Amino acid sequence: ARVTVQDAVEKIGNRFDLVLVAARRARQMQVGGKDPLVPEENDKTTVIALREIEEGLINNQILDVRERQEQQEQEAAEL
Amino acid sequence: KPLVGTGMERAVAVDSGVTAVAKRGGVVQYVDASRIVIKVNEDEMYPGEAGIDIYNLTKYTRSNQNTCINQMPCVSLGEPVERGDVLADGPSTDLGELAL
Amino acid sequence: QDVVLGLYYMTRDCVNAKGEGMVLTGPKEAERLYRSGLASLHARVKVRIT
Amino acid sequence: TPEEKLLRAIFGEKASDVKDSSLRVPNGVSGTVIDVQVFTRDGVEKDKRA
Amino acid sequence: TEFLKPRLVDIEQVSSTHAKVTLEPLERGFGHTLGNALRRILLSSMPGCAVTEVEIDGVLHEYSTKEGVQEDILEILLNLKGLAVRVQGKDEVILTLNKSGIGPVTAADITHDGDVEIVKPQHVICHLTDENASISMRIKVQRGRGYVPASTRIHSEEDERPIGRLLVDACYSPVERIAYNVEAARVEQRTDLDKLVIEMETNGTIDPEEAIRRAATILAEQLEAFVDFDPILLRPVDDLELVRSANCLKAEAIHYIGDLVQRTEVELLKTPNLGKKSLTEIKDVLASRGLSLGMRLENWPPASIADE
Amino acid sequence: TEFLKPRLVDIEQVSSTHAKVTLEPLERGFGHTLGNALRRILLSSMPGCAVTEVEIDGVLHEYSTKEGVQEDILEILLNLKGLAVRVQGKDEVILTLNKSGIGPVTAADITHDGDVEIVKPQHVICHLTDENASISMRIKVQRGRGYVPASTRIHSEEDERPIGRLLVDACYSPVERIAYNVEAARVEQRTDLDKLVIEMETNGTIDPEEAIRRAATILAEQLEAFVDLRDPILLRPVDDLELTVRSANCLKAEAIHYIGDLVQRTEVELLKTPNLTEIKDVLASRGLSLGMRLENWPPA
Amino acid sequence: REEAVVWDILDEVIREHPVLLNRAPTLHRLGIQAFEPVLIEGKAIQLHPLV
Numbered sequence: 001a002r003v004t005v006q007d008a009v010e011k012i013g014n015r016f017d018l019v020l021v022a023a024r025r026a027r028q029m030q031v032g033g034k035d036p037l038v039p040e041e042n043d044k045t046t047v048i049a050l051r052e053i054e055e056g057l058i059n060n061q062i063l064d065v066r067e068r069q070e071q072q073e074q075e076a077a078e079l
Numbered sequence: 080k081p082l083v084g085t086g087m088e089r090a091v092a093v094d095s096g097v098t099a100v101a102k103r104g105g106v107v108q109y110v111d112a113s114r115i116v117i118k119v120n121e122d123e124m125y126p127g128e129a130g131i132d133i134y135n136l137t138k139y140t141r142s143n144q145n146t147c148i149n150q151m152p153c154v155s156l157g158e159p160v161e162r163g164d165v166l167a168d169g170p171s172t173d174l175g176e177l178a179l
Numbered sequence: 180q181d182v183v184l185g186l187y188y189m190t191r192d193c194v195n196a197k198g199e200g201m202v203l204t205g206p207k208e209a210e211r212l213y214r215s216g217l218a219s220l221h222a223r224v225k226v227r228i229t
Numbered sequence: 230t231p232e233e234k235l236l237r238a239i240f241g242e243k244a245s246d247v248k249d250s251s252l253r254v255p256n257g258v259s260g261t262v263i264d265v266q267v268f269t270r271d272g273v274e275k276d277k278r279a
Numbered sequence: 280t281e282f283l284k285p286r287l288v289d290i291e292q293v294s295s296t297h298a299k300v301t302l303e304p305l306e307r308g309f310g311h312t313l314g315n316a317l318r319r320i321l322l323s324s325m326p327g328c329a330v331t332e333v334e335i336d337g338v339l340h341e342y343s344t345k346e347g348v349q350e351d352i353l354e355i356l357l358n359l360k361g362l363a364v365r366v367q368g369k370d371e372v373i374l375t376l377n378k379s380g381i382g383p384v385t386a387a388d389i390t391h392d393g394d395v396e397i398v399k400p401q402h403v404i405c406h407l408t409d410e411n412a413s414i415s416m417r418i419k420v421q422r423g424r425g426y427v428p429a430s431t432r433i434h435s436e437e438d439e440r441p442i443g444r445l446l447v448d449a450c451y452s453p454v455e456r457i458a459y460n461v462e463a464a465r466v467e468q469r470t471d472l473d474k475l476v477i478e479m480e481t482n483g484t485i486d487p488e489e490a491i492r493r494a495a496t497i498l499a500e501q502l503e504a505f506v507d508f509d510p511i512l513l514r515p516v517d518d519l520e521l522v523r524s525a526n527c528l529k530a531e532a533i534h535y536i537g538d539l540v541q542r543t544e545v546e547l548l549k550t551p552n553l554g555k556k557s558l559t560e561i562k563d564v565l566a567s568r569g570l571s572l573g574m575r576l577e578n579w580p581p582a583s584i585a586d587e
Numbered sequence: 588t589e590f591l592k593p594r595l596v597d598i599e600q601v602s603s604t605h606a607k608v609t610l611e612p613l614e615r616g617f618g619h620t621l622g623n624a625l626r627r628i629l630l631s632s633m634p635g636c637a638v639t640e641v642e643i644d645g646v647l648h649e650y651s652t653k654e655g656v657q658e659d660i661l662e663i664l665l666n667l668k669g670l671a672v673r674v675q676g677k678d679e680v681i682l683t684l685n686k687s688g689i690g691p692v693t694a695a696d697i698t699h700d701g702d703v704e705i706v707k708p709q710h711v712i713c714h715l716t717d718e719n720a721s722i723s724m725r726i727k728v729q730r731g732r733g734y735v736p737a738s739t740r741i742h743s744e745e746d747e748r749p750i751g752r753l754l755v756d757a758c759y760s761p762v763e764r765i766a767y768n769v770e771a772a773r774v775e776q777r778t779d780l781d782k783l784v785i786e787m788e789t790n791g792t793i794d795p796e797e798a799i800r801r802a803a804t805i806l807a808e809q810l811e812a813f814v815d816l817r818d819p820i821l822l823r824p825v826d827d828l829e830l831t832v833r834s835a836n837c838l839k840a841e842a843i844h845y846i847g848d849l850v851q852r853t854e855v856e857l858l859k860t861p862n863l864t865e866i867k868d869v870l871a872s873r874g875l876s877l878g879m880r881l882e883n884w885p886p887a
Numbered sequence: 888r889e890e891a892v893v894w895d896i897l898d899e900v901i902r903e904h905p906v907l908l909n910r911a912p913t914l915h916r917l918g919i920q921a922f923e924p925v926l927i928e929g930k931a932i933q934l935h936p937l938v
Contacts, residue, residue: 002903042902043903044902044903044904046903047903109716110657110716111654111655111656111657111716111717112652112653112654112656112657112658112659113652113654138652139263139650149659151659152657156689156716198428198430201428201430201448202353202356202357202448204357204360204361205361205455207455207456207480208455208456210456211322211426211454211455211456214318214322215322215323215426217426217428225353227357259738259741261648261649261650263648263650280632280634280732282632282805282808282809284808284809284811284812285809285812286812286816287812287813287816287817290817300817302812305809306632308627308628308630308631308632309627309628309805309809311627312624312627312628312806313809315623315624316620316623316624316806319616319617319619319620320620323615323616324614324616324617326588467891467894467895470927470928471928488817491813491817492813492814492817495810495813495814496810496814497590498620498810499807499810499814500590500592501592501593501617501620501621502803502806502807503592503807504592504593504594504595505593505595505799505800505802505803505807506800506803506804506807537876538876541876541878541879573879573880575818575821575850575879575881576874576875576876577818577820577874578873578874579874579876580871580872580874582872
């Protein structure tokens, strides 16, 4: 969170993928125009993403499902 | 002035080339915050010249390290002045003593 | 260096100060005592902790 | 460049053949000016201030 | 002299015995001042009633033991210190405590009257081990402020008390532990001033916010000799849940509320469709919608114009 | 309860610089309450009158030198901090000072005013040495509390003063240094009762009785937080409409500056000019009309 | 021009914005550690006593 990253690497298990699951995650509010799922708490998005992980709703896999289903709502939408 | 001194100041402050050393003596005739007019003692005097000395102090002027070198008077109006005195102080000097 | 003196001054055992071996009920009221001047820091007592 | 040329075209602004090299205070300095000193070349004219 | 008086912003209360009462801002040199100048009150000078004297039958001193009791006499003396009480109108009340049964002796066991107020009835005072023995003691309550332990109390009580009468370190003040701090506070150019943060936990028999009212009075009383848009408003007159304010406005080329508010009800009512009863159906409209007599409209007409 | 309220008792005024105030009654511990809590308030927030802006003719800046004066000019500004002057009513007084010939310009060389009370007129300000030495300064005196340096006034006021106005920092605080003691007060039936002497040593300008009357005035008001509290269209000009060349030849012939000045007139007040459907087209779009009367106009 | 809103736009940004502090010679891996600022008004850098 604001001070440490222990309680999120208890979930992720690595000191670099917690950066990498949030390097992927924390662009969607800078230029992606989206909103988080937790209470915002006036936070900069490099910890808003860290909040979403350490609230147990995000690992690397569950990010990969919302990025798949976005593409199959543009694929037949053209046709 | 410093309270725990070492008896070295009024030799090292004098011979530092920053104060005014009384080559001759006499009484202070004219004293100013610009320069000092002193009149030569008559047993110190010479039959050629009249015997009136002037020392133009060097006011607010830079140093190399961008600090200030102003010399300051410390003498009084109409007072006896020995030879070899501290007529006008240096910048960091107090009455002839080093005051860092 | 600074705190490691002050911790050593805080926890000490001087045999003489005041209130040697009196009763206490909590470390809150231990700080009722020293802040009142009615005791000292380093003086042995009989207490309760949880 | 033709954007600025159009800005020249709207307002008719004619920046001359003159270019700025003004000696300014290094920002973050306070104080008071205690001397202006002038060194002019030999034979060349002199101005009203000097 | 244009002093920066504060406003209290907040209490952060944890439970019914605890609070953190912050503040911002003060000037430098009064934040450290007040946060100490109250702490000398809450230690020594807050008036309350406490347990003072202790009388049990069949005892001689507290170093001794009592069979049928789990604990020591000192630990039972310890409990009455952690006991909370409130004598309302009297100035010296004595109570009794008699039990039987296998188990603890909670603070319901005191024979009280209506002027002595225990806040914590679950407070155990003794434990009976087996059914045989029992506790029968008498305890005494006195009023004062601060703290006096029984060391210097017997230096101040020169009574040659008979054997069997005990004395505890009285807890007169209600404050159990308070602390305070100083952080920095900002006014939008001056980031030099100091906030006040105070942490406070007291016992029962009080509100944790009532003390800072009560104790800061007493320091001050010492000083008195020293200071001496709407949706149907986008909608014509036929659809506003009314019917004699609808049919007779559109026949002056005002088909809507628009020029109704600029035009004057001395002429719009003088036209041969309205009159002296329409002002109940225009001015009551202008009560809820706020518009005036002659008002300039910000954005009235859209592209749509129609009728019925 | 058995509380006891104090009285101001004694003003044993030892000097015009050195003083002593006793105080009684005080209970146990409340000596350390009211011995301490005044002292931190007393050392900072006392309003006094102090020198701010000394200005001499013929001296451009604080690093210049003037003849007939024995002293350097910054040092004379450092002399002029130590001035105790008791001013009563206003907050700004401009003293004036003159002298001629040999002789030290001291603090007894001011043309005095009525509510001006110099405390210490014997203080040395300068030492004129020449016969044609004639100094002349134009000093602003103010009245304030706290500390202000020179650079604080600089950024806070963008308004540019004339040259030669040589500032001095604002040492307002007219207390110097205090101490106090806790001894016993002799009241018979209450033998624990304790007295308090507050020796106050400072400069002039302050009667030490009123120093504490204002000091409790400071403290007893910060307890009051505790003893109580627990149209853009209207100003739009004529050229924004991309309006027709014939009617802009007329609205500039009918001498109307703003659109609020146009609707100050009505539709009838436009028809007399040669060379209504256009304004009835465009005013109905962006939220306007005609015939609307304006009052309390213009608002500049 | 050091204008009025300039501070309180900066004050929003440096909240939850990390930063580095490095001392030469950074003689081991802890010679360069991240920090988070809390803006003071002054001219020098205040450090935590256990770093």
